[PDB]
Curated annotation (Swiss-Prot), chain B:
This is ATP synthase F(1) complex catalytic subunit beta, mitochondrial. It comes from the Eukaryota. The modification N6-acetyllysine is found at K58, K112, K117, K154. The chain holds residues 369 to 527 of 528 of the full protein. Belongs to the ATPase alpha/beta chains family. GO terms for biological process: proton motive force-driven ATP synthesis; proton motive force-driven mitochondrial ATP synthesis. Catalytic subunit beta, of the mitochondrial membrane ATP synthase complex (F(1)F(0) ATP synthase or Complex V) that produces ATP from ADP in the presence of a proton gradient across the membrane which is generated by electron transport complexes of the respiratory chain. ATP synthase complex consist of a soluble F(1) head domain - the catalytic core - and a membrane F(1) domain - the membrane proton channel. These two domains are linked by a central stalk rotating inside the F(1) region and a stationary peripheral stalk. The keyword Transmembrane helix does not apply.
From Swiss-Prot, chain D:
It comes from the Eukaryota. Transmembrane segments: none annotated. It comes from Bos taurus (Bovine). One of its GO terms (molecular function) is proton transmembrane transporter activity. Subunit delta, of the mitochondrial membrane ATP synthase complex (F(1)F(0) ATP synthase or Complex V) that produces ATP from ADP in the presence of a proton gradient across the membrane which is generated by electron transport complexes of the respiratory chain. ATP synthase complex consist of a soluble F(1) head domain - the catalytic core - and a membrane F(1) domain - the membrane proton channel. These two domains are linked by a central stalk rotating inside the F(1) region and a stationary peripheral stalk. The modification N6-acetyllysine is found at K100, K129. The gene is ATP5F1D. This is ATP synthase F(1) complex subunit delta, mitochondrial. One of its GO terms (biological process) is proton transmembrane transport.
From Swiss-Prot, chain E:
Heart muscle (at protein level). Heart and liver. This is ATP synthase F(1) complex subunit alpha, mitochondrial. Homotrimer. Component of the ATP synthase complex composed at least of ATP5F1A/subunit alpha, ATP5F1B/subunit beta, ATP5MC1/subunit c (homooctomer), MT-ATP6/subunit a, MT-ATP8/subunit 8, ATP5ME/subunit e, ATP5MF/subunit f, ATP5MG/subunit g, ATP5MK/subunit k, ATP5MJ/subunit j, ATP5F1C/subunit gamma, ATP5F1D/subunit delta, ATP5F1E/subunit epsilon, ATP5PF/subunit F6, ATP5PB/subunit b, ATP5PD/subunit d, ATP5PO/subunit OSCP. ATP binds at Q47, Q49. Belongs to the ATPase alpha/beta chains family. The siderophore enterobactin (Ent) produced by enteric bacteria binds Fe(3+) and helps bacteria scavenge iron ions from the environment. As a consequence, the mammalian siderocalin LCN2 plays an important role in defense against bacterial infections by sequestering iron bound to microbial siderophores. LCN2 can also bind iron bound to endogenous or nutrient-derived iron chelators and plays an important role in cellular iron homeostasis. It is found in: Mitochondrion inner membrane; Cell membrane. The modification N6-succinyllysine is found at K1, K72, K80, K105, K113.
From Swiss-Prot, chain F:
Keywords: Acetylation, ATP synthesis, CF(1), Hydrogen ion transport, Ion transport, Membrane, Mitochondrion, Mitochondrion inner membrane, Phosphoprotein, Transit peptide, Transport. GO terms for biological process: proton motive force-driven ATP synthesis; proton motive force-driven mitochondrial ATP synthesis. The modification Phosphoserine is found at S121. Belongs to the ATPase gamma chain family. It is found in: Mitochondrion inner membrane. Subunit gamma, of the mitochondrial membrane ATP synthase complex (F(1)F(0) ATP synthase or Complex V) that produces ATP from ADP in the presence of a proton gradient across the membrane which is generated by electron transport complexes of the respiratory chain. ATP synthase complex consist of a soluble F(1) head domain - the catalytic core - and a membrane F(1) domain - the membrane proton channel. These two domains are linked by a central stalk rotating inside the F(1) region and a stationary peripheral stalk. Gene3D superfamilies: 3.40.1380.10, ATP synthase, gamma subunit, helix hairpin domain. The modification N6-succinyllysine is found at K24, K90, K129, K245. GO terms for molecular function: proton-transporting ATP synthase activity, rotational mechanism. It comes from the Eukaryota. InterPro entries: ATP_synth_F1_ATPase_gsu, ATP_synth_F1_gsu, ATP_synth_F1_gsu_CS. Coiled coil: none annotated. This is ATP synthase F(1) complex subunit gamma, mitochondrial.
């Protein structure tokens, strides 16, 4: 186990947070080139 | 036809009733994009009346163009600046309908008279977007705009 | 001959009926949602 | 020899290349992969992979997370959800973000939110300590 | 001639990618810029009942529109700009209009002066 | 028919032909972009599959759960993309249910949900919309993987069905298996893998799931855009081939009308 | 007048969603029910009372569940039943001209009874 | 045209042969939706005959209505019930075609007389769905539906 | 229409001036593909002339077809043979243009009168590939092919 998994997270969420951090920590130039191809648009429907 | 074609030149104002609109149930069937007039000028009827009339015509024409695309794509694919255009155009089509006092035998409703100010204000508001939250059927066969609001409320309540 | 705007509805063929039906479907759905929202707003506004 | 495959979802860096040694971070802890390393699976920590080509040159890429597989046939697959060369980063931003995250660390809204703050903190920590 | 020669080509190019106008996005910057110039050019040609314009004023408006001093403007406002810019030029720079009318040509001196006028006005709009 | 009828029909068909021509242009643009973006995603996904490829993990055949993730988009007009994917989904679901396995279905895209909402209506576990409007990203795959893991369904095996993009003309409805850490752990082929406790293994399984979902999204998006290009090209060609005959008929009818009116006039003139 | 007021409107709505939700699905079902009710034989006209009886049965919703291909026969059977059991009701509707509230209740009873025992 | 338009009112049963069908190779080219008779009465030809004939006409008419879309958006844009209807309609269009005795020299196929009961039975089966697995061509230019099944078997090998 | 229908029974050839080729700067605008002729028969004009004309038509049709693919799938995905045919087709297009002694005031170029045999020779050479090693503009508005070669030299000196 790891400390983040203690809250019940999954490695997917861990990678999401880490990648979000690195994205936030980019040059002003590369933000415009990395902000796209990063977000998500999918959305769920109740079953 | 030669007969109506020749008569068109002898009138100061024509209101071309249309069968296609009457099939949609809009009554009177007057065709907004074919009825013309000679006093429809910013000098004779006023700036705001003219701007609203031209806005109604332009939005209806845009809707006519969009229907061709809706033929193939479907309407889910339309952008979000056009779904608004289609919705507004349908609302305006419905709002142009009205119940007459001599048609109580057919429709059963009560005939109404809508003074000029009510019509101009209602169409201004429909164009501006002040009624995107009401269903289009709220405008069907009503007089002034406030009656459309009341009818929408009654539909919601009885829902 | 040339092409006008909104001639698919005028022709009245299968494509025109398909127009009118699909558009009625979509706006029936949206009207149901708007009526629901109107009722819910009414309840949230009696307070 | 080693067949190295380093890839991000968006771009690709090495593709069945032939590198000598590659140093990768990990949850169980840093390690270096050589031409016949014993097979393993691991998931990365936010660190900086270093690759040494057949000739002696070092390429450093900061990776945020992902996985690394070393197989029986000496074929390394290093997949990173976000890989960037060190020149694509700015200290000031990262340091400010680290300080901000620590500032929110006091506000332990909940075990979950605490976890997210901690992950941000360590990610930015490795960011700065590789950049500085 | 100097101005409409290129306006004709710009509109000709616009007319052959007019269909996309609805889709608008999903297309390269080439056709996007084509049909962003075409829309502005079209909205310059709108005019009102019984208000013809002197040739020099038409030339000035089409010059502003086609040389490119309008592609950074929302189409709906174009007309206003016109109805403003026109008046502005009529008030202050009557000498330039007189020179265009008499010479019947846009001399490079007049061309430069007109570019300056358009840039200055478009800046403060 | 009367001249007016043919005129109206011809005008409508001209409109449709123009619309489909522009549609083919747009779909070509989107497909070029997607096929450009699918280069890195192809090697990325192939790398992700590497492990289960070169250390084969067959599942113990005495399980009870499964999962079938079909991948498609919301939009139609794209040939038999959604048709083929849903056909494969239902084929596999019925074959599995023959053995009594309790299957569940996740559809990525509204079309897949709809095509299978008559039969397999209950088996749905979750579905997603807004696919294909914009190019998919790893964010989308991570969202799907999360909404899968969180749902209280501990599947023991799984398959993902999508449309591998062979070429701008052809695509193949492929299926890729996906396992669960319970199966991964108890596979003899895994004995040769060191530093594998039952924790890195299933962090790795979560990541592998996200990877395969992202790969399938990219493949299916490229395939769908190529299919829409082809379908709209065929529709435009059909519309033009129809306008040929309609124009010939229109010219014949126009001449017939002129002749008929003229004959009526001269027959009246002669009669008096 | 009473029955046609609703029936014409329901058909008018169904006619614009014919080329195909829950509410609209119910609308299409009802429209198809009415349309199958408007079919007729040949050289077999019906009294106005029977026409209004069957139209009422179909438009109040007492056929929203029966299968489409069965309405064609249901109607027929239903008519016989009334013409053989409740001719007094039909005579009352015909003479009175209008459908009275007691007559409406009698029709409601008869329609539900025949529906239950028809399957 | 005035001549046929006028003669239509003097005939009990008409049989409109159409070039559009003949260009498809179907023969006799009879147009099912223009042919009429005055003895198409359930009290004259019975109820099974009348019902089968009307079901055939209904399905052919539905397919004709679909043809406008099919000719552009292809059959890949139809609901599943519509695809099934189109399949049945094509099967029926083909099954209506028959080889005549006097057309042996043209076609070479042996001429067939199909008794009325066999015709009703075959069309009833095609409408029920007993032959949704065979291909269209299994029905092209055959007598009773037994020959259709036999030809489908021959094609399957 | 009866007027053109009656006229075309007498036309022995057709020349289709098209705007779409005046825009491209090629003059005369004669459309190489719409233009036809009755005497494009090996018996009448000869075997070599017929074969050259057929080759030019075939390559121009191929380039017309490939223009759409270049406009859609991009140029980078064309085989070597496809790119070679595109180069040949562009060179042939430019070679069809000629300077007219009466349009000197427009082009300024001195007018040329290309005799038949020189035209056949030039197009034979261009098609066979002898001039794959010259730039497109070396062919725009030149008379014989040898003049095109001279232009190619003088544009790199």
């Amino acid at each position: 186990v790891a400390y983040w998994r203690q809250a019940g997270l999954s490695y997917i969420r861990y990678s999401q947070i880490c990648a979000k951090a690195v994205r936030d920590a980019l040059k002003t130039e590369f933000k415009a080139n990395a902000m796209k191809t990063s977000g998500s648009t999918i959305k769920i429907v109740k079953v | 036809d030669p007969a109506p074609a020749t008569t068109f030149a002898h009138l100061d104002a024509t209101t071309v009733l249309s069968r296609a609109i009457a099939e949609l149930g809009i009554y009177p069937a007057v065709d907004p994009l074919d009825s013309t007039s000679r006093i429809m000028d910013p000098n004779i009827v006023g700036s705001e009346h003219y701007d609203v009339a031209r806005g109604v015509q332009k939005i209806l024409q845009d809707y006519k163009s969009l229907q061709d695309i809706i033929a193939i794509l479907g309407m889910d694919e339309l952008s979000e600046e056009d779904k608004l255009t289609v919705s507004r155009a349908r609302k305006i089509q419905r709002f142009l309908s009205q119940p007459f006092q001599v048609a109580e035998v057919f429709t059963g409703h009560l005939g109404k008279l809508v003074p000029l100010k009510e019509t101009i204000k209602g169409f201004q508001q429909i164009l501006a977007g002040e009624y995107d939250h009401l269903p289009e059927q709220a405008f069907y066969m009503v007089g002034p705009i406030e009656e459309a609001v009341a009818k929408a409320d009654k539909l919601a309540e009885e829902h | 001959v040339r092409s006008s705007a909104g001639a698919v509805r005028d022709a009245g063929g299968a494509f025109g009926k398909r127009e009118q039906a699909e558009e009625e479907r979509y706006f029936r759905a949206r009207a149901k949602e708007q009526l629901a929202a109107l009722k819910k707003h009414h309840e949230n506004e009696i307070s | 020899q080693m067949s190295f495959t380093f890839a991000s979802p968006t771009q690709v860096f090495f593709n069945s290349a032939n590198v000598r040694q590659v140093d990768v971070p990990t949850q169980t802890g840093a390690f270096g992969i050589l031409a016949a390393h014993v097979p393993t699976l691991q998931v990365l920590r936010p660190g900086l992979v270093v690759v040494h080509a057949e000739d002696g040159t070092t390429s450093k890429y900061f990776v945020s997370s992902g996985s690394v597989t070393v197989n029986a046939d000496s074929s390394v697959q290093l997949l990173a959800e976000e890989a960037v060369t060190l020149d694509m980063l700015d200290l000031g931003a990262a340091k400010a973000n680290l300080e901000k995250a620590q500032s929110e660390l006091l506000g332990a809204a909940d075990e979950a939110t605490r976890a997210e703050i901690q992950i941000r903190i360590e990610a930015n920590e490795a960011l700065v300590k590789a950049l500085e | 001639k100097q101005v409409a020669g290129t306006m004709k080509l710009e509109l000709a190019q616009y007319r052959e990618v007019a269909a996309f106008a609805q889709f608008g996005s999903d297309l390269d910057a080439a056709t996007q810029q084509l049909l962003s110039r075409g829309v502005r050019l079209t909205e310059l040609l709108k005019q009102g009942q019984y208000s013809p314009m002197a040739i020099e004023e038409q030339v000035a408006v089409i010059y502003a529109g086609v040389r490119g001093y309008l592609d950074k403007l929302e189409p709906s406002k174009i007309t206003k700009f016109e109805n403003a810019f026109l008046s502005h030029v009529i008030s202050q720079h009557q000498a330039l209009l007189g020179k265009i009318r008499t010479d019947g040509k846009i001399s490079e001196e007049s061309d430069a002066k007109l570019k300056e006028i358009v840039t200055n006005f478009l800046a403060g709009f | 028919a009367t001249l007016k009828d043919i005129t109206r029909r011809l005008k409508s068909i001209k409109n449709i032909q123009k619309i489909t021509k522009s549609m083919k242009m747009v779909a070509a643009a989107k497909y070029a972009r997607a096929e450009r973006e699918l280069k890195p995603a192809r090697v990325y996904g192939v790398g992700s599959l590497a492990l289960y490829e070169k250390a084969d993990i067959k599942t113990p055949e005495d399980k009870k759960k499964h999962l079938i993730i079909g991948v498609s988009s919301d939009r139609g007009l794209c040939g038999a993309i959604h048709s083929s994917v849903a056909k494969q989904m239902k084929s596999e679901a019925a074959n599995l249910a023959a053995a009594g396995k309790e299957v569940k279905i996740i559809g990525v895209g509204d079309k897949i949900r709809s095509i299978l909402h008559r039969t397999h209506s209950d088996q749905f576990l979750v579905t997603f919309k807004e696919v294909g409007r914009r190019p998919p990203t790893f964010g989308d795959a991570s969202v799907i993987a999360l909404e899968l893991l969180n749902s209280g369904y501990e599947f023991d095996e799984g398959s993902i069905i999508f449309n591998r993009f062979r070429s701008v003309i052809s695509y193949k409805t492929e299926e890729k298996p996906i396992f669960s850490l319970d199966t991964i752990s108890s596979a003899e082929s895994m004995s040769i893998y060191d530093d594998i406790d039952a924790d890195v293994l299933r962090n790795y399984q979560e990541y592998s799931l996200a990877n395969i979902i992202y790969y399938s999204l990219k493949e299916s998006t490229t395939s769908e855009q190529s299919a829409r290009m082809t379908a709209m090209d065929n529709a435009s060609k059909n519309a033009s081939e129809m306008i040929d005959k309609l124009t010939l008929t229109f010219n014949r009818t126009r001449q017939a009308v002129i002749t008929k009116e003229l004959i009526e006039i001269i027959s009246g003139a002669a009669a008096l | 007048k009473q029955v046609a007021g609703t029936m014409k409107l329901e058909l008018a709505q169904y006619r614009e969603v014919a080329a195909f939700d829950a509410a609209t699905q119910q609308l299409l079902s009802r429209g198809v029910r009415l349309t199958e009710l408007l079919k007729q034989g040949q050289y077999s006209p019906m009294a106005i009372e029977e026409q209004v009886a069957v139209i009422y049965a179909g438009v109040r919703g007492y056929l929203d569940k029966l299968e489409p291909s069965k309405i064609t026969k249901f109607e027929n059977a239903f008519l016989s039943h009334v013409i053989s059991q409740h001719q007094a009701l039909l005579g009352k509707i015909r003479t009175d001209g209008k459908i009275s509230e007691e007559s409406d209740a009698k029709l409601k009873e008869i329609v539900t009874n025949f529906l239950a025992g028809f399957e």
